[PDB]
Design a protein around this ligand. Structure first.
Ligand code: J0U
Ligand code: J0U
Lengths: 316, 319
């Protein structure tokens, strides 16, 4: 619902050789959109103009590792704690005392941690698909993962270099293979690690999902030539550090306004994984989108737009 | 904020194929767009940026076309007011701003009066430092007005492409140290620049530092001007007839939006007197006046500028 050369582009240095890029549209309260793996500010293309038109100032991030943002190679550059402190510095250098934070997938994880540890800087928090679950102090992090078969792909992502080689091999194939409606899926996150890697049993020349044009796919291809998949995959490589930081939050509740949006056909981030979030956030507002897979903003833009705007205009 | 550039959000908006505008951005609230003069930088607003942000405003401090990190195309016609204003509208469009408050100084002040005139739907409110709004006289030219006022002789020396460039670019530290002074510290005569050779021919080789500026501040302007030099900044001065014709096409419509005129007692070229009948053409005009203030108003009297702009913004443009 836009093209890049028609956007205002913003750059903030959050530490010496680390700068975050964002796209900025609209006037009103600051709304900070944080994309997932492996995405772009561009994943918000349907939300950016709608939220601006509804009276919001939209900052659509390239998250660290993506697009025009720095992509340092070290795994530890991408633990939640480093990523949240940088976002705080991002607000500081822009002179925002607060923003609304809206995240999807890994961006959803970031915004929950922001709301947990930096509630004074977060006006309101909304997650697409990604639930908030307080740290389970004697469930081995690695035990949770191999206790859910559909998280098998995450194991394949651990070894530095392997998923990079496969994902970077044919970028147009990577994005055409990932960015599909759930009824169009050509992937099985079930048996990734033992059945080769990710694309071994899937088309060499995948068709175009009903969700995406060729132009849209070529935009993600062009972005991922800058730094490739190392930075993005490093979001998946901080599980123990992430758990240990979450543990340090112990009792504390999210007292700020909060929205959780579930997607019926996300088979990895299943709606049921949110089911007891009221126990830890009782005010939490909820949305639910039918016939919506993992790529929520791209799959059901109309539904996402109506749920975010309604919620933005009412709670915070 | 103030001092440090790498401590700020930097924004870039492509307004046409060969032209992208750079700005620094600080704060939440109503958009306030600050437009510097000749030969300056977003950095001339270094004292206003954190003050306006702390007062509840979203500050966009422009590198104007020809300056800093903004596009500086070499053609004179790229710097007439009509092209510069149309580009500032495109700038608002691509940022998704229906309106902004525009605050200008010197050539920037000129730009914001013309925005207020031709694009009032896009201008929430307009404030000029030093630069008056005088409606176009259909009978006399700029050339006749200029010649009449001896203190505009520097403007004549500026018209010949290459000349004022060569002198101004020769020693950038000397240029800025010579330009950026309080009125009582002036080492320049704008009286006969033309006959007396050029601008610095009878002024110190190694000028002292003005009480207004540090060595570091000067080095900032020097570094910015190494990229594109003075050609684009000087082109602002080389569109008098195009600007006059454009202004005439107003046909004496009024500026009906809220407006602030700030005068500087010791600005000896943009004299307070030049503003004296601006009410006739601007119904909602408020005034500020700064004593012991030369041309470089933001630098000279930051405290007084900050209080006048914040007071006016908080009364006549929401907050
Ligand atoms: C289903 C979820 C809520 C998490 C995964 C969600 C997305 C992939 C966006 C679970 C999960 C992983 O499966 C893999 C991980 O590290 C490779 C992590 C992860 O979440 C961990 C976590 C545990 C407890 C807690 O309170 C917060 C957490 O983020 C940490 C982690 O990095
Ligand atoms: C109002 C003023 C005192 C102007 C000077 C102001 C600054 C140098 C910031 C006068 C002036 C010049 O001296 C030189 C110029 O073109 C080289 C111009 C200029 O203003 C002209 C102008 C006249 C009438 C009008 O209604 C609008 C105008 O912009 C145009 C011009 O470029």
């Amino acid at each position: 619902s836009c093209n890049p050369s028609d956007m205002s582009h913003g750059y903030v240095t959050v530490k010496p050789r680390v700068r975050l890029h964002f796209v900025e549209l609209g006037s009103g309260p600051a709304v900070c959109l944080c994309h997932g793996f492996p995405e772009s500010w561009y994943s918000w293309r349907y939300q950016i103009p709608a939220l601006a038109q509804a009276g919001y100032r939209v900052l659509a991030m390239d998250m660290k590792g993506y697009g025009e943002s720095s992509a340092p190679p070290e795994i530890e550059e991408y633990c939640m704690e480093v990523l949240c402190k940088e976002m705080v510095t991002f607000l500081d250098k822009l002179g925002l005392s607060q923003a609304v934070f809206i995240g999807h997938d890994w961006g959803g994880m970031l915004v929950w941690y922001m709301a947990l540890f930096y509630p004074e800087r977060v006006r309101a928090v909304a997650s697409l698909n990604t639930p908030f679950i307080p740290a389970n102090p004697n469930m081995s992090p690695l035990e949770s993962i191999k206790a859910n078969p559909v998280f098998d792909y995450q194991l394949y992502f651990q070894e530095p270099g392997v998923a990079e080689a496969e994902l970077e091999q044919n970028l147009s194939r990577t994005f055409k293979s990932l960015f599909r409606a759930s009824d169009e899926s050509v992937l099985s996150m079930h048996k990734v690690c033992e059945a080769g890697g990710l694309f071994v049993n899937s088309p060499e020349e995948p068709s175009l999902s009903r969700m995406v044009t060729e132009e849209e796919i070529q935009f993600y291809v062009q972005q991922f030539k800058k730094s490739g998949f190392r930075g993005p995959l490093n979001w998946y490589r901080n599980m123990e550090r992430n758990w240990k930081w979450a543990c340090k939050s112990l009792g504390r509740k999210i007292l700020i306004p909060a929205l959780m949006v579930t997607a019926e056909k996300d088979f990895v981030l299943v709606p049921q994984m949110s089911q007891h979030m009221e126990d830890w956030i009782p005010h939490l507002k909820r949305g639910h989108i039918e016939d919506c897979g993992h790529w929520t903003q791209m799959d059901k833009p109309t539904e996402v737009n109506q749920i975010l705007i309604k919620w933005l205009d009412s709670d915070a």
